[PDB]
Amino acid sequence: VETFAFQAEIAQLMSLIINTFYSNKEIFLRELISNSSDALDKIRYETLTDPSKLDSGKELHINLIPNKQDRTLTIVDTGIGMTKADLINNLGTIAKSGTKAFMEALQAGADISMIGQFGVGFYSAYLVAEKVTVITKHNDDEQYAWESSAGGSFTVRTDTGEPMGRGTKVILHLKEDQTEYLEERRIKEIVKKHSQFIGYPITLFVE
Length: 207
Ligand SMILES: Cc1cc(C#Cc2ccccc2CNn2ccoc2=O)nc(N)n1
Known about the structure:
Elements lengths: L1 E4 L2 H12 L7 H21 L14 E6 L4 E6 L6 H24 L21 E9 L5 E6 L4 E6 L8 E8 L9 H11 L7 E3 L3
Parallel strand pairs: 2-8
Antiparallel strand pairs: 1-6, 2-3, 3-7, 4-5, 4-7, 5-6
The structure holds ligand A91.
The site of ligand A91 has 18 residues, from helix 2 and helix 3.
Subcellular location: Nucleus; Cytoplasm; Melanosome; Cell membrane
Family: Belongs to the heat shock protein 90 family.
Organism: Homo sapiens (Human)
């Protein structure tokens, strides 16, 4: 297991999301589904010129899986997936400028719900999760497990769990007072309100 430190700017963003009083937490879902949609659009586009890129799975969809026993809400997509390089450097590099812009916008009057317009919506997951685990598999890389409870660091390890073929699984270990996001009617409500026109099937599993 490798332990890495977030760039100061991203750690700052995460603490703001965790510390700022902001009731409209449900927007975290739209941000994650949006990321999944972008990842699906990407593998889709790439397969138009290299069909073999779908040998790891032709289905392009999103699964939303709640589990009360483990108190988790998992967002699963069969998108392009992330490389180890994305996990350690690429994503953080891009998020740096997005965070700055977002920060400046906030002090200018914007609010947390607009985080997605700055390209760093992923971190909104910390509005409802005490810990986030990301299992991902990109075509020319191994399957990895990324994890972070914020606090300034994250870990990456080669994942030996059940292989997923291709895609990303964001596991949200929900905070004790945010279990409403495990309820089918609540998830259904949120998807209908903020993600009704996603161009991929979104299946809401039931417990
Ligand atoms: C390929 C792909 C990418 C994403 C994403 C993202 C994204 C976009 C902007 C800033 C930070 C991130 C993610 N950062 N993450 C997620 C695990 O390790 C990280 O550093 N989400 C999905 N579902 N699929």
